[PDB]
Design a protein around this ligand. Structure first.
Ligand SMILES: Cc1cn([C@H]2C[C@H](O)[C@@H](COP(=O)(O)OP(=O)(O)O[C@@H]3C[C@@H](O)[C@H](O)[C@@H](C)C3)O2)c(=O)[nH]c1=O
Ligand SMILES: Cc1cn([C@H]2C[C@H](O)[C@@H](COP(=O)(O)OP(=O)(O)O[C@@H]3C[C@@H](O)[C@H](O)[C@@H](C)C3)O2)c(=O)[nH]c1=O
Ligand SMILES: [Mg+2]
Lengths: 368, 374
């Protein structure tokens, strides 16, 4: 069958859908994946036919409303959920014309979207084909839905809807120990990494004679360009008897004797003792899946609550970026206390026991 | 488990192994794929961790022997098999130092190689781990083995071997109707395309008001750079009531835009555009042949040497293709009209598509790889 995958505006959103898209292609299905123009090379470098959904970057949708007026940034975690629903809602609204042009010429039998790829819900409703919602992290996939429904009220009213339509199938990757009590029934799936690759050098897959700490701020150029966070973290680990690796975009690495640049996370994370990040859901999954403890230093966003569930489980520590010596103390505790790695290995075993993307293809086929 | 895939020196060799490598990664295995330095971006753009096996291109291995002496190019199809075994053998020999450095630090539990990725056979024997040979086209995977064994005699002697070791498992993609009578038993697999991708434009996935002819000379820059073949084919199709698309490397398309204006030339993901075509015209490329076969599209084979010529003749004898004895305007023009006009060719191509579709999925074949280390 013809399956249209809808990613968003960040490389992590392409990576989160690449296992199921490649599994469907491997089963003989005709698969296309859509994302913002800037993300098209990431889809192509995942080996999937790529279509552009809008020529605008995430920064356009984040900083301004539909009328082009400046949007104030969130000040609290409660504000973050509403703010995300709105900018993801705006990106979805800005993606409809290109998705209509593509699906008029190549009509999919099924549409698969990520957590906040709301244009997948809308185009599937317009086409009258089943809509599959795939969680792209261990956070609640529906966590920005009320604000997103409010943003997309004109598009939803045109379809005769009052809120975002419920998917025909919900595909979840959250391991049982991290799933909330109010989580809806789902087709579970084993998350597997599918991040951007590059020529491997021996240091990437071989551990050194010292503990290794990986530091990253994600794959979003608009947030990664704020090098202050990465320089701050590197400065806070100076006293530790540890090798520090900065995993960041190559163009950001240019501005930064510390190793900085794109290092395929799935390859390097099993050689690390700690993974330090900005509260990025897919980096969080890479660490968990490899059974590696992680330090979460939240830089806003909407994964903060889900990252606190990993911390409460004991496979991570959530600290404040602006509490002196907190990053240093937490790194020492994650390397030195074996309980963090034991809980991370427990989460790795839970992920490994979930249905394979190859088996989940059968659930997509059952819908049509 | 840790699985090392070994591609060769051409993008098509990376594409031929990418479905099984991604299926193994999708099953939770740790997968690395090796190829010549020039092919490393193709592995990475297939979403697979990439290691370089040698810094030398296929041109180095094709034109010079180990002592640096010039190698004369073959003339006959019998000569082609021996020429290929010797140059693939040289590429394999030149790949051993880097594969030893990689596998000393990342020890695989299993090694999977393409049809003529002979370094996969040697590195697996050295490590003492099972070796999986995966056919990368419908041609006989073992067709260059005697000359390859001769070339790799120093490396094989060091392992106490007289010839290339037999794989622990042979994975074949050749549909039953095209398999020779002397083909060894195999784990069959459904071939799926996994070629280099691009931003899609509507013309790539939408057919026009006229029949569409795709023309290509493959993904090897050393052979694609010979633009004469592509220019020649387009000129031979001028009288036909059909649109012509040239699928070639972008750096080769740069030369064609100043030489042949008004014709579309450049990298088109073949899996996307081939179902919109009436005919696929190629240089006798096995993976293009499979793309056409799988989409149920008739194909025109205009052999430019190589070792797929015999396997392409089997498709031609089955009736899902035509091979031309000479590259003349009259033969290319006639065979084209016959592939568009006579419905039997597409009927046969759809039969081969149904045979491929009935073979075990790459996801199921992962289980056969696991059974070898069990
Ligand atoms: C910089 C860098 C990144 N990556 C990959 C790893 C991971 O798959 C992705 C980074 O994503 P991450 O979860 O760190 O955050 P972000 O890129 O900001 O992605 C956003 C925010 C997440 O919280 C959310 O779960 C994503 C779906 C979108 O990119 C690499 O493999 N190597 C690198 O060097
Ligand atoms: C130029 C071009 C190529 N491709 C892909 C399609 C196909 O997967 C591959 C071309 O391989 P092909 O079978 O045409 O031949 P070649 O590139 O010369 O590959 C050699 C010779 C084959 O006979 C043998 O089967 C290959 C493994 C190696 O590259 C595209 O998707 N788009 C393009 O524009
Ligand atoms: Mg000899």
């Amino acid at each position: 069958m013809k399956i249209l995958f809808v990613a968003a505006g960040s490389p992590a959103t392409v990576f989160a859908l690449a296992p199921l898209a490649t599994a469907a292609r491997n089963a003989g299905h005709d698969v296309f994946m859509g994302a913002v123009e800037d993300m098209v090379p990431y889809i192509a470098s995942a080996g999937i036919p790529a279509v552009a959904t809008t020529d605008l970057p995430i920064r356009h949708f984040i900083t301004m409303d539909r009328e082009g007026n400046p949007v104030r940034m969130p000040e609290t975690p409660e504000e973050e959920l509403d703010f995300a629903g709105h900018w993801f809602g705006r990106m979805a609204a800005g993606s409809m014309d290109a998705l209509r042009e593509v699906t008029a010429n190549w009509r999919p039998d099924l549409v698969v979207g990520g957590s906040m790829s709301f244009a997948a819900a809308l185009i599937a409703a317009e086409l009258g084909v089943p809509y599959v919602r795939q969680a792209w992290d261990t956070g609640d996939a529906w966590r920005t839905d009320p604000a997103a429904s409010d943003e997309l009220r004109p598009e939803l009213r045109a379809l005769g809807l009052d809120r975002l339509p419920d998917p025909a199938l919900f595909v979840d990757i959250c391991p049982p120990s991290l799933r909330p009590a109010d989580a809806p029934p789902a087709q579970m799936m084993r998350w597997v990494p599918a991040n951007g690759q590059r020529r491997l050098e021996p240091w990437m897959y071989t551990k050194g004679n010292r503990p290794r700490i990986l530091v990253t701020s994600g794959s979003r150029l608009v947030f990664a360009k704020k090098t202050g966070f990465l320089r701050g973290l590197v400065a806070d680990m100076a006293a530790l008897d540890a090798e520090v690796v900065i995993a960041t975009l190559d163009e950001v690495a240019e501005e930064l004797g510390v190793r900085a640049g794109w290092v395929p996370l799935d390859v390097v994370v099993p050689t690390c003792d700690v993974v330090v990040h900005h509260a990025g859901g897919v980096t969080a999954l890479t660490a968990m899946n490899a059974g590696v403890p992680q330090l979460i230093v939240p830089q806003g966003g909407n994964f903060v609550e889900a990252g606190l569930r990993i911390s409460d489980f004991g496979a991570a520590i959530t600290v404040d970026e602006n509490t002196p010596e907190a990053v240093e103390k937490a790194c020492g505790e994650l390397i030195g206390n074996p309980s963090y790695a034991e809980r991370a290995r427990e989460l790795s075993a839970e992920i490994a026991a979930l249905p394979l993307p190859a088996e989940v293809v059968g659930a997509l086929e059952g819908l049509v």
